[PDB]
Amino acid sequence: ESQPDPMPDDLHKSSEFTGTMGNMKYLYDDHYVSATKVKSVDSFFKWDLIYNISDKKLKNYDKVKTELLNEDLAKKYKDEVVDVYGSNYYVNCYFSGGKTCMYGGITKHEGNHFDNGNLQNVLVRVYENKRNTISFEVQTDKKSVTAQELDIKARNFLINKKNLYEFNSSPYETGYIKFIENNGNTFWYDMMPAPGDKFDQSKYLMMYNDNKTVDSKSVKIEVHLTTKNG
């Protein structure tokens, strides 16, 4: 069965996070690793794969390590031509040009694109205190895309248009992004940092571990946010 939707108590509260929200915003504000048609060239531990991908932007890395949920997943893509898309981190990024790390974000390149650069739109409906406030679409060049990629694009949008995350704190108390697959299966991610005075980016991004992918042409996205009072 699909993952049970979250109850209030099941969600992190921004009011219980006393660190700097800017460190969460950082991970989604025009921030991501993207590469097309590449093959891993190394591996640190048996559950990760290393790729030669350069920071087109500010030349901050030429090596990217992505960690997967387990060895089989790494084995699966080790020798495949793939596309990569995910949110990277530097703090506590370690492995034997600059380096950066991430989790999942891997999809087979062969026969996963749209003949002649077309892009697939994906619906995202935003709810604030249980009511749909705005609706929009994110796009992807992949037929089977990682939930991570769509999540990142959704949050990037909301950061700019709803100040989802700001330097210190957020306008919202709780937030989760839910995916609804065309077969009825659903799952969600908590959009707020764990309670405490520090945000562990690496530990947070580990959730993209499973390299979960969905059908871009049929999946639907729901972002459910709440304000502390209403």
């Binding site: 531990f45 370690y94 530990k203």
Partner: protein, 179 residues
Amino acid sequence: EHVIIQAEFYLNPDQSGEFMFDFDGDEIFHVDMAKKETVWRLEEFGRFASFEAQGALANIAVDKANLEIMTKRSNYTPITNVPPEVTVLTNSPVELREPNVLICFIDKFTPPVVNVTWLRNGKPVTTGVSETVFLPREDHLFRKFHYLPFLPSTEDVYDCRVEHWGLDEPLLKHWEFDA
């Protein structure tokens, strides 16, 4: 009168890595490299002390880099397999129908890779079993412990089955009620 050891290792081509603290031979904790968190040997330790797991991840990366350089420098001299010494004992004097635990001591071996299974009357046992990570030794070989909780009986026959590259064939250490 006391020794505290921060022990680390990286093994190729298995890509095995370990970081642990030892106190007079007993493990204080080790870092789970995948979950990136501290795994305390005894639950209570985690309530009396803390540790920043990230420190282990940084060191393990340096350890691998160093291994690579050293491997090349030695003209790729491989490690010589040293088979383990396997022993099985109870943690306390055994008495019928009295809960006890079988301890499988896997000692004096290298490299740090082994397959250990428990057998109850020729069949593999999984319920309630637990094991430790690899522990250091002064001669630089390793130790390891596997545990099997059980209820003594004059019928059952147990086996600690150990496989290691230093062994030509699986080693089965027999254990049965003889008290």
